[PDB]
Design a protein around this ligand. Structure first.
Ligand code: DRA
Ligand code: DRA
Ligand code: SAM
Ligand code: SAM
Lengths: 330, 336
């Protein structure tokens, strides 16, 4: 029988089992401490704050105090202008950090498969973003060349982006390739941001917004259909019906492009971030991160076969994702 | 300076990671490790044994495998070396500490309200669960049972001159039983809330200590029902604000017989202790977040004691056998 050491127990207490520090880092981010210093210009109880700072000091985020109180190298990651933007990710008014707090309901989540977001905040995730302007804006800012660059658009005329958000990706494919038409299918909130972006990019003549619900049949056909970070939001049955709607909308010889996290045997991709994203999707909305093989198999059920596979990444965070091109079977 | 890759890795996986600690608490709660040790080899069997959603569970397990608590499955699924900390019989008892049906992990969830703790200096426990810590345990007996079981420790002072020990807030009475068994001439009295007090009655009756160790249910904010030549305050003061700690201290001074000694057992940091300040601050944030308490340095405890009329006679370092946790034993005399 295996026997824990002093170092195992130290890792459990300080890292793997530690819920205090992650909360302390979120509070610190939500007071721009690594900026505000460059801490009581903050509406904070004076005693409470130094108690927090003492903890932030011990875990390698600050130094100094009663020589001078300055962030460490690590501490700089909560610097507003750092290109990892971890300060905004951790900010408690932001939509992700806000969602993260629902992890305290993880017990029920695992008992039942059901999301926790509603239990903590009233509305399920997407409904909450559209009724609350501030969470929509912050989520938007956090999720802002992969497809436009990875793909030969010369043999394509019409791209239908399903659940394509504020239109950023469709705008860019269209700006890169002047000959293309595009159509975006989205809920109201992101649809309206799409209209504004298309109009200001001078694309309204060839790139349109069709507000709607991707569980209902898609309004148009197209020779390329895009599902970019959509499937992971949904359960198998729900992702199956989105896929099936996508197949119907596919012109002859048309291609479905799935942009998502899709791990492969010897990928080299950090499984930590795969499981983390996975538990987030489970907890926030009952979705799931799927591997390459699982996506392929769900696509097969919807009448689609894999034609090609490629990778992209991130100029910011350690996150490899894939683009999986599918054709109709019959 | 410029943050390296390594420093981003640490923030995301450790310092900023709220998911993994909740995953540990869920695993502790479902007794996942114990179920694997008692024969469960498959995912399916685990799921029936824990009455959980099979796919959801397998996804928790994948996360637990990645972070090093579990390993293989896909030979069969078992704890890692580190994961054996979650076995219920491990001396560190981390499975019970992390258990979401137990008081401490329960109260840990109130850390989501930390922003308003840092803003107001008030505890968050009430904002989440309705009533504040001790009131809650008072009203919810299953949470009070688990809190008493967690503080259980299942001493090296000089007891030969001592006749009567008063343990103020002495939990279910483990400290008092240890002292009495080591010093047979001694008499004992425990003051505690109703739950701890009955569990202490049971302990002493079972041990053969009832004829010289007695229990008095009571409240240490009201005057104490006996005097003793030694009074003990073991991990009481850190639950309270300066003000409440002071009215406990004065209650204890009043029950201190002529020439008596007040023993305070608490975390009492000193500048060159070498004691790990991670645990000092963690526990400090917990006392703030849970009940408006505070962990005090040696100087702060000794200054507070001064206001109640007490002078320090001696101080000793000791520490838990199981966890990395130094603490101190501060002996005081009534200054008149
Ligand atoms: C730490 C890594 C990571 O960002 C990983 C993951 O983000 C993925 C998907 C992002 N998108 C699209 C939402 C984003 O992917 C992009 C999209 C973009 O089209 C692609 O090329 C863009 C570049 C920008 C632009 O010019 C337009 C035209 O095109 C770029 C290289 O990658 C990011 C880099 O990786 C990701 C995270 C968190 C969350 C999500 C993620 O997809 C979610 O989808 C998510 C969610 O859906 C609901 C609640 C919470 C979350 C999350 O908390 C992460 O933690
Ligand atoms: C990370 C570990 C640690 O358990 C540290 C701390 O526990 C300490 C104090 C415990 N007591 C008394 C409350 C308890 O300490 C012990 C063990 C020690 O060996 C024992 O005696 C000594 C004296 C020296 C000696 O020779 C040997 C043989 O015996 C002493 C009387 O009690 C525990 C094992 O360590 C401690 C923690 C958490 C909490 C508390 C703690 O005291 C609390 O007191 C606490 C609370 O009071 C209310 C809500 C929540 C908490 C907590 O969440 C943890 O952080
Ligand atoms: C992760 S997001 C953004 C994905 C986007 N393709 C991107 O890469 O930025 C998923 C999107 O799908 C949308 N969505 C959710 N339910 C929907 C539905 N029933 N119909 C259409 N869109 C929906 C949301 O509005 C959200 O913008
Ligand atoms: C950390 S605990 C246990 C301390 C115990 N001396 C030990 O070291 O194991 C604090 C204790 O003080 C008690 N307590 C809280 N309020 C009290 C009160 N008003 N009167 C008596 N005991 C109280 C609790 O019952 C709890 O057992």
């Amino acid at each position: 029988p295996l026997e824990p050491t002093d170092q195992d127990l130290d890792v459990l207490l300080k890292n793997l089992g530690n819920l205090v520090t992650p909360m302390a880092l979120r509070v610190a981010a939500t007071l721009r401490l690594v900026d505000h210093l460059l801490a009581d210009r903050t509406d904070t109880h004076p005693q409470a704050l130094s108690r927090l700072v003492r903890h932030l000091t011990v875990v390698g985020v600050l130094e100094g105090g009663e020589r001078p109180l300055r962030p460490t190298r690590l501490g700089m990651l909560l610097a507003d202008g750092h290109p990892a933007q971890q300060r905004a990710w951790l900010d408690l008014n932001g939509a992700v950090s806000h969602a993260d707090l629902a992890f305290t309901g993880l017990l029920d989540v695992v008992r039942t498969g059901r999301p926790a977001y509603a239990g903590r905040y009233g509305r399920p995730f997407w409904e909450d973003l559209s009724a609350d302007v501030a969470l929509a804006d912050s989520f938007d800012a956090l999720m802002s060349e992969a497809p436009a660059d990875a793909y030969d658009w010369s043999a394509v005329r019409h791209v239908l982006d399903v659940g394509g958000g504020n239109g950023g990706m469709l705008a860019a494919i269209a700006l890169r390739a002047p000959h293309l038409r595009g159509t975006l299918v989205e809920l109201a909130g992101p649809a309206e941001r799409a209209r504004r972006r298309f109009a200001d990019a001078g694309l309204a003549d060839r790139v349109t917004v069709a507000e709607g619900d991707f569980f209902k049949p898609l309004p148009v056909t197209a020779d390329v259909v895009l599902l970019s970070f959509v499937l992971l939001n949904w359960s198998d049955e729900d992702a199956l019906t989105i896929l099936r709607g996508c197949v119907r909308a596919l012109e002859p010889g048309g291609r479905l492009l799935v942009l998502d996290r899709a791990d492969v045997e010897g990928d080299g991709a950090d499984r930590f971030f795969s499981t983390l994203l996975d538990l987030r999707m489970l907890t926030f909305m009952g979705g799931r991160v799927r591997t390459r093989d699982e996506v392929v198999d769900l696509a097969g059920s919807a009448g689609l076969a894999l034609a090609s596979e490629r990778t992209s990444g991130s100029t910011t965070l350690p996150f490899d994702f894939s683009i999986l091109e599918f054709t109709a079977v019959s």
